[PDB]
Amino acid sequence: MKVISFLNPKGGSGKTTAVINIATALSRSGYNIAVVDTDPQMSLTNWSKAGKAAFDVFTAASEKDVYGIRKDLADYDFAIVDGAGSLSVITSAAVMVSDLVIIPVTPSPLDFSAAGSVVTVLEAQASRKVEARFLITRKIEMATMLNVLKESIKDTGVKAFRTAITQRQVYVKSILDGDSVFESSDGAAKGEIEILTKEIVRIFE
Ligand SMILES: Nc1ncnc2c1ncn2[C@@H]1O[C@H](COP(=O)(O)OP(=O)(O)CP(=O)(O)O)[C@@H](O)[C@H]1O
Numbered sequence: 751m752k753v754i755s756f757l758n759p760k761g762g763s764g765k766t767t768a769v770i771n772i773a774t775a776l777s778r779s780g781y782n783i784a785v786v787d788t789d790p791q792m793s794l795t796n797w798s799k800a801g802k803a804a805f806d807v808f809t810a811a812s813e814k815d816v817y818g819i820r821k822d823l824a825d826y827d828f829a830i831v832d833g834a835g836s837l838s839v840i841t842s843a844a845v846m847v848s849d850l851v852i853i854p855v856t857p858s859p860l861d862f863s864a865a866g867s868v869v870t871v872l873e874a875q876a877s878r879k880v881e882a883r884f885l886i887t888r889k890i891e892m893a894t895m896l897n898v899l900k901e902s903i904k905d906t907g908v909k910a911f912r913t914a915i916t917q918r919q920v921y922v923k924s925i926l927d928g929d930s931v932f933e934s935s936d937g938a939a940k941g942e943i944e945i946l947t948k949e950i951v952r953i954f955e
Contacts, residue, residue: 752954753819753829755844756852756885759866761835763854764887766794767921770803771831771939773844775947776828777804784811786819787810788844789834805830816843840873850881850953853908856888857899869906881953884910886948888917903947913946 756765766789773783783805787795798807808823810816816831823829831844845851851872855865872882884903889896903910915921920936931939 751820751824751826751829752850753814753831753848754850754950755831755833755848756854757831757833757841757844757868758854758865759835759837759841759867760832760861762861763856763865764885765789765833765835765854766797767888767925768852768854768885768915769830770794770797770925771921771930771932771943772947772950773805773828773830774803774932775943776830776951778932778948779951781827782825784808784814784823784829786823786831787831787918788816788831788840791835792831797925797928804930804932810840813839813843816840817847819847828866837867840953841868842874845871845875845880848880850883852883852885852950854885854887855899855903857886857890857892859895862899862902866873866906869908872908881951882908883950884908886910886914889914890917911946911949913942913949915946 756769758765773785777783785805786808788810792809795809819829836838853868918939920931920934920939924931
């Protein structure tokens with residue numbers, strides 16, 4: 751049983767979307783996935799109602815739900831947590847019961863300062879350090895800032911995944927329909943997502 755948590759208070763960094771597709775990716779790899787929607791808006795939960803996610807969804811009404819994750823979904827292979835868009839007791843709660851903490855971040859001109867807040871909490875873990883990665887979400891080939899973000903990431907002392915999720919239309923249209931990119935035909939999207947999943951899987955050795 752391994753708990754993975756996508757955390758980042760600054761809403762708009764692609765938490766949900768990355769979670770939806772990555773969980774869907776892992777499911778196709780034979781892993782019994784379980785996702786926890788810790789966001790008040792219940793975005794991933796309202797989505798899960800549309801169709802039928804390739805994984806199970808749980809809505810963490812409060813912190814109590816997150817803390818118990820290790821005991822509630824202990825039968826699952828992975829417990830992918832969908833962080834909320836605010837620095838609540840949950841933001842830190844996720845870090846505690848997690849084995850890997852992904853930090854979704856999109857290249858913007860003024861908003862990489864919403865992301866370090868998580869990196870600080872990652873330190874609060876003295877023999878109890880939890881693995882962490884930097885996920886580059888919503889990528890556009892505007893060479894310039896992709897580099898600014900890329901560099902400011904190392905100032906944290908946290909390595910970022912080799913691959914990044916580009917800004918494609920399928921990622922938005924997938925949600926509208928009620929499913930993921932794996933239900934479409936955008937091989938370009940499926941590609942990067944899979945290559946990203948394996949990278950996450952390669953972590954647990
Ligand atoms: N790879 C991608 N390509 C195109 N649009 C994307 C995208 N990833 C995310 N988006 C869009 O960006 C917006 C914010 O993404 P998302 O809803 O994942 O953010 P969050 O704000 O991280 C979600 P939540 O807090 O619900 O977990 C949405 O409008 C979404 O459709």
